[PDB]
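Hi support team,

I'm filing this because I wasn't sure whether my run with D31 finished correctly. The job status page said complete, but I'd like someone to confirm that the output block is well-formed before I use it downstream. Pasting the exact inputs I used:
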Amino acid sequence: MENFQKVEKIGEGTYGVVYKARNKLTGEVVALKKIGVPSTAIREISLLKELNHPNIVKLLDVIHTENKLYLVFEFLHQDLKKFMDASALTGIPLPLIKSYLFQLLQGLAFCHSHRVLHRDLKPQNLLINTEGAIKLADFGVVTLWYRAPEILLGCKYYSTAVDIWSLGCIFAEMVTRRALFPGDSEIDQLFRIFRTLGTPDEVVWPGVTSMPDYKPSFPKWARQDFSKVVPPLDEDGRSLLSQMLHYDPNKRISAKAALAHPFFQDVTKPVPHLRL
Ligand SMILES: NCC1CCN(CC(=O)Nc2cccc3c2C(=O)c2c-3n[nH]c2C2CCCCC2)CC1
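And here is everything the job wrote out:
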């Protein structure tokens, strides 16, 4: 727009490029996302500027000019991926990990209550500020690391449970300082999940053998010990995590239910120490 002047390219998303820009009018710095334009979609996005939550990056404005679509979001100073890389030496403190997980579950609970899912949760689209907050951003070579199993198996009508899986993967990563399922292809992704949680069957996941991309020929791996998977997460944390990583989407814990888990008994809001 004629009112915004780009400062620098923040990066490349999947729905277009994102730029850090200054609003020549308000003088504010924002995150500018550049994407005729489908009308059905216009009404959709117009609905995003409506669902506001403390843990959802605010969509300040939606500019639709010359068949171009510009989404103006609030600017946050860092993403979780960066913070985690900067904390690789000692890891993010548990209290802060617990605080971020809680906040993200809150944002998700809100999203899901309005039948809105993220679909592509990952460290790169989780934004944080100096205050100690974390927010969901960029709603739905792309990473497959946080992709839920029903998605990898071809379920077209997946549920809000896919976001819980992704968050579960992010939660484990914050704790061990290592991606849980770092696949580099759908099948590799799938098998890495199978090797760790065991190949799903009709017993733990009824209806799994009737999934679009399910192959009767998939190898049959045994489920690995969870204490070996996510140490030194305490029993409450591992208990919560296992419930977020259930194969059966219907058995997987909901965001609202997860907030009441014992793990958050002693949850606080620590302030992050970050370099900008
Ligand atoms: N970490 C940046 C990559 C992942 C996220 N995308 C796509 C996307 O949809 N980003 C955003 C959507 C709404 C608000 C923001 C961003 C976004 O990227 C960003 C925002 N506010 N602050 C930032 C950055 C600050 C510097 C470190 C990287 C994040 C760009 C590449």
